[PDB]
Symmetry: C4
Subunit: 161 residues, 4 copies
């Protein structure tokens, strides 16, 4: 598969969250690469990664970070590719710091932000798929099948007891 | 015993909370039906459920959901029956997202909102009973007896340990 | 020993917090009575308790409640004795609901509010002692000795290693 | 041996479970420090004496950690002109939100340089104290730059989260 998504994160611990994005992309048969890129510990690598993403064929970036989360916004500052932000749960503030430091970008440089935590990692993969589905009919077919199946599963299990 | 209450929730995991509503209704001998209805995964079923509730004889709907909780508000948009919202505790924000997404309805479509979590599930049943008690003398007697025995149990155990 | 403090709480579970007030009062040799008084389940008892507290010789009331905590405020509405409020930690909102429902009394009826949780229960006892110490030299001496011992204990143990 | 340049203080013994990580970082940087329990609420007189003596003793930075209604950093900054760093200790009831606001929201006139809630802020208080000292002490500047260079290279050497 062509590698269409860069799935990046500030630290190894963030992988416990963003692995769920990767699992969802695998389920949809969408090619991706997963890489640790730290805004704070590898700032020059962040610039290289963002600068070269478009030329390497990436079309969507999913960036996860926690706390004072600067990785998604700084990548969006350095590439015009759409950047999705996953707020990682933080130990002290339950990802509220993560959420506000990702979603509240001032006008001019956007980051499309998903839910705090695992839900947001899964939804970042589903949202990247929706973006790619406008271009790639096989991805659109895969996404619609995913949504149809998830709908049918709830319909066929209506009783909580 | 007529089925007067529809007890609905977005997902199977919500039942861990809304089962306490069901237990309370069973204690008051009030007929209900419990069903999984997802605003996000079964939107068409949500609309059909709300459209048909009155014709099926339901008089109150108790709807529980967590996170960005859209189930109560969309049911209230689609039936004129009173809809009670139970904010389910969320893992990341402790049901604060659930609470605000249910209670803060703009003017025009109301949802009567109860406490976050189990306390709100129990109180949604007691509140549905209070609604029904204006019309059904047997339910008024059951609710008054419940409240009197609840009061006496505290009075009968005045000393802590 | 004369009973100078009424130590009241809305439910048995609150005693896990307010027992630390009782312990502190025991250490200061201040007489108190501890009782379950529920704003929501025994409202008539709350009114009788408040009405009779002054004639009974009580001088300070410590009231603990969690969630939508109405017990301290309604006692303060029904007796002119100083009422101290202890916000009990809540399962869903970590006592933030408890704190705001106690401290934010509108002008006209005050509740002297202490910290959320165990720290506030201990401090409610110490503050009640501070109130009584204006009257009772034995209590003033006990409180000053408590404060002197806790200061000297920290001074005598300056090294965290 | 090492002259003591940092006073590392905290309101209670339980705060040491957080500030020990500041001590560990200063040990790694070979910076002389002294750790002490100084309680704004239980030893107010000692707080004033500690702050009054700090400059003459040769301390150049104070790291102060406290939780809840955290008054230790601000009152030390009120009583010495040395730079005071504040570490908000995570509180059991409010997760250090009370700690954070009672430290960082100082009115104009008396500053406290505030770090992250909890262990991250304890580590960063040590690194920030090193940055302050590095302007004056080239040995500490070299230790701090080496710490940063090593932590950068370690991430660069481990790019794949799947191992
Ligand atoms: Cl770098
Ligand atoms: Cl559907
Ligand atoms: Cl009563
Ligand atoms: Cl002192």
């Amino acid at each position: 598969k062509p590698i269409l998504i860069g799935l990046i994160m500030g630290s190894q611990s963030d992988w416990q969250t963003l692995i769920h994005a990767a699992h969802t992309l695998d389920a949809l048969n969408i090619g991706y690469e997963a890489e640790i890129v730290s805004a704070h510990r590898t700032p020059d690598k962040l610039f290289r990664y963002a600068e070269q993403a478009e030329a390497r064929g990436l079309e969507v970036i999913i960036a996860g970070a926690g706390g004072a989360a600067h990785l998604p916004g700084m990548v969006a500052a350095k590439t015009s590719l759409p950047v999705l932000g996953v707020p990682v749960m933080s130990q002290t503030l339950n990802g509220v710091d993560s959420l506000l430091s990702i979603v509240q970008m001032p006008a001019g440089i956007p980051v499309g932000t998903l839910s705090i935590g695992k839900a947001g990692a899964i939804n970042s993969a589903l949202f990247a798929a929706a973006i790619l589905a406008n271009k790639y009919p096989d991805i659109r077919a895969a996404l619609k099948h995913y949504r149809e199946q998830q709908t049918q599963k709830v319909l066929d299990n209506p009783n909580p007891k």
